Design a protein around this nucleic acid. Structure first.
Lengths: 157, 158
DNA sequence: CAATCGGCTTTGACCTTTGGTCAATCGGCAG
DNA sequence: ATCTGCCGATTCT
DNA sequence: GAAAGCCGATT
């Protein structure tokens, strides 16, 4: 009945998952891998294109992204900001509202990192925990949103 | 030689374009500042940013885009939202097939010389007065800094 | 080529027989 | 409507 | 008083 996209942002790996809804089915999962040897604009451009393509194909009602709290080197925050920007243009273009959730919100909603993954595997009925780590986390975010959405406490912006 | 300069921000984004003759001298082709607000949905702020930039790139067809680098960021969250802004730009820069270059403040100040730098920008472009507001002025300086490095063959991509 | 891995987490100016302090940075809300 | 100006600066263990 | 991640190196 309900379709939710989850995202774990980063410039090198970006986790991208989609679920249909507490029990849900895995509709899609991928990780976008871009290189430092790649021109900045090519890196982010590919990101935007893949996300846009995905949003178009599956038409989710919501996108959920991982919030983050500390950032040892300000520069790192910036490049992650770049990644969320591509997403946002994509989210904007698709007319899909965007929501963001912190790690404790995820952990509490669903559960240790190893402990959370076990619950994601279970809700989606998979033989094994999803890989790699960035995809798994993206899916957790999607599922966290669904949970809050189910109780009417969405968290936009 | 056509060069775009950009001063990134989520609230105010400076956007300027110059055409270089060196004997370094250039003409102002375009200048604007994109204003968005926190009362606006995140996706609408950034989306408008991407659209304006993409429209501008399309109209003026520059050979390069230059953006301001930054060094400190007291609150990591600030860096993030600026990251958002650069992302919209990059999609735009990607879509237009325009290479992107980034420069730090000292590179700008040395190449051209805050009040002292502005005076030099005013001069090179032959304007009656220094450009306003501050975010547009800065964007233009970045464009002009790139041209300078480009002229000596020391481009600085992203 | 996948995946895995371990390190590094801001900076420069000018000053202070020496490594010190120092400021820089921008977004939300108020006139 | 527009510039102009100030203040904060990472949680949860 | 720690939380993540990206890079550039491996294998």
């Amino acid at each position: 009945h309900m379709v939710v996209a989850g995202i774990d942002p980063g410039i090198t790996h970006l986790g991208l998952g989609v679920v249909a809804v507490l029990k849900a089915r895995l509709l899609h999962g991928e990780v976008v891998k871009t290189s430092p040897q790649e021109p900045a604009k090519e890196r982010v451009g590919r990101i935007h294109a893949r996300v846009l393509e995905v949003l178009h194909r599956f038409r989710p009602e919501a996108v959920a992204v991982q919030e983050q709290f500390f950032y040892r080197q300000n520069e790192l925050a910036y490049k992650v900001g770049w990644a969320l920007g591509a997403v946002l243009v994509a989210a904007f273009e698709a007319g899909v509202p965007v929501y963001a959730y912190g790690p404790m919100q995820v952990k509490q909603a669903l559960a240790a990192k190893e402990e959370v993954a076990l619950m994601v595997r279970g809700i989606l009925g998979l033989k094994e925990a999803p890989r790699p780590s960035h995809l798994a986390d993206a899916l957790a975010i999607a599922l966290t949103h669904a949970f809050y959405a189910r109780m009417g406490t969405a968290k936009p912006l």
